[PDB]
């Protein structure tokens, strides 16, 4: 016996216990104390499944996400699907799956953070370049989502407008090797990294250790929030054995980036919500910061499976965070060939706005404190 709104979460629980102890809570007796927040779950359950919180263009459009306690990697909510009934208790949880492309949300942790963290750029005001450009060593143009080019613009603006050209070039200056290393620090990895990975989590391999999932993303972005510490995602607190003994589960974060980098990424990302691309997930009273993301079709997919000449996309994402809870949201149809259009592309932000509202309607909305080693200067931030 267990509630349906806890299916996905309970599954992850069963696995973590097995991973650490080697025992299966299904074929062995024991009590387990997890990290879930029940009301948060029912709240999340209501958001997906009802029609009171957000306008789903239909009942098929799927949603999946993970909410993490930025201070310790504790997962306090996870829901892999919506309106998807067929009780097969403990099935595939789309919140831990890496089979989907997180697109643009990949920029902050793959190109820009490393850049700042390694000297490439020294200020959010640095002039980057959005001009015609091909993938390094190749003649394949890196096209901006709208086929246009902005010219010289600041780091911030390029991150806030989600321009591709300045992103893949940034990865070039950071170096793939250093970049892949920096990604590991945040819990993400690929069997092999390429320049396309500057704007896509699409990878040759497909274990689980490779790629990005609402789980991994929310834990990666939590490092910005918590100041630069990477916390392994945790679902279980403690497990008392039938024979009296207990096993307590402790997680110890690691320095993923300097505080400076974290603060800087956070400042550029606060602008994403304001005059940036993440406007639909903006809250005047809540000092949060995030990044919107979109993936794209192959070309064979465009010329053979896409009808409308509208703006389409197999995945819409959002990975926002506050001073307390980091949250990564994925949205798309079960079959990537069914596109997201018009009001369907907006669900990722709203779901995030909605949930994050609830999660912070009380608390005491706090802001970040510019760390020693930096100094403001109008819209931007500079290094000493």
């Amino acid at each position: 016996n267990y509630p349906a709104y806890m299916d996905n979460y309970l599954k992850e629980v069963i696995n973590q216990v097995e991973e650490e102890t080697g025992y299966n809570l299904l074929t062995t007796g024991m009590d387990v104390y997890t990290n879930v927040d029940q009301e948060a779950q029912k709240h999340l359950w209501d958001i997906y499944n009802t029609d009171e919180y957000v306008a789903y263009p239909d009942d098929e459009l799927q949603v999946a996400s993970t909410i993490v306690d930025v201070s310790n990697g504790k997962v306090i909510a996870q829901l892999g699907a919506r309106h998807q009934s067929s009780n097969v208790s403990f099935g595939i949880n789309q919140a831990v799956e890496t089979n989907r492309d997180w697109g643009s949300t990949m920029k902050p942790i793959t190109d820009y953070a490393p850049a700042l963290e390694y000297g490439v750029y020294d200020s959010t005001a640095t002039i980057v370049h959005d001009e015609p450009y091909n993938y390094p060593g190749t003649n394949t143009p890196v096209y901006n989502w709208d086929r246009g080019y902005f010219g010289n613009i600041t780091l911030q603006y390029a991150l806030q407008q989600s321009r591709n050209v300045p992103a893949v070039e940034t990865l070039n200056k950071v170096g793939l090797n250093r970049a892949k290393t920096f990604l590991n620090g945040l819990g993400i990895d690929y069997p092999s990294i390429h320049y396309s990975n500057a704007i896509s989590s699409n990878t040759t391999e497909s274990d689980k250790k490779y790629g990005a999932s609402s789980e991994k993303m929310a834990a990666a972005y939590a490092a910005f929030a918590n100041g630069g510490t990477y916390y392994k995602p945790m679902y279980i607190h403690k497990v008392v054995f039938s024979d009296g003994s207990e096993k307590e589960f402790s997680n110890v974060g690691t320095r993923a980036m300097k505080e400076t980098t974290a603060y800087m990424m956070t400042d550029m990302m606060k602008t994403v919500l304001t005059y940036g691309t993440g406007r639909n997930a903006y809250l005047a009273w809540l000092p949060q910061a995030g990044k919107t993301g979109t993936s794209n079709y192959t070309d064979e997919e465009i010329e053979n499976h896409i009808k409308t000449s509208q703006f389409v996309a197999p995945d819409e994402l959002f990975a926002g965070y506050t001073r307390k809870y980091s949250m990564a949201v994925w949205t798309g149809y079960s079959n990537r060939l069914t596109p997201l259009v018009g009001n369907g592309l907006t669900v990722a932000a709203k779901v995030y706005r909605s949930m994050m509202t609830y999660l912070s309607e009380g608390s005491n909305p706090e802001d970040w404190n510019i760390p020693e080693g930096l100094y403001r200067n109008g819209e931007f931030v500079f290094k000493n």
Binding site: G29, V32, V36
Partner: peptide
């Protein structure tokens, strides 16, 4: 045979 799970408020949320 039995295993109980409690949320963060230690209030049992399921029995498996």
């Amino acid at each position: 045979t039995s295993s109980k799970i409690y949320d963060n408020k230690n209030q049992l949320i399921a029995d498996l």
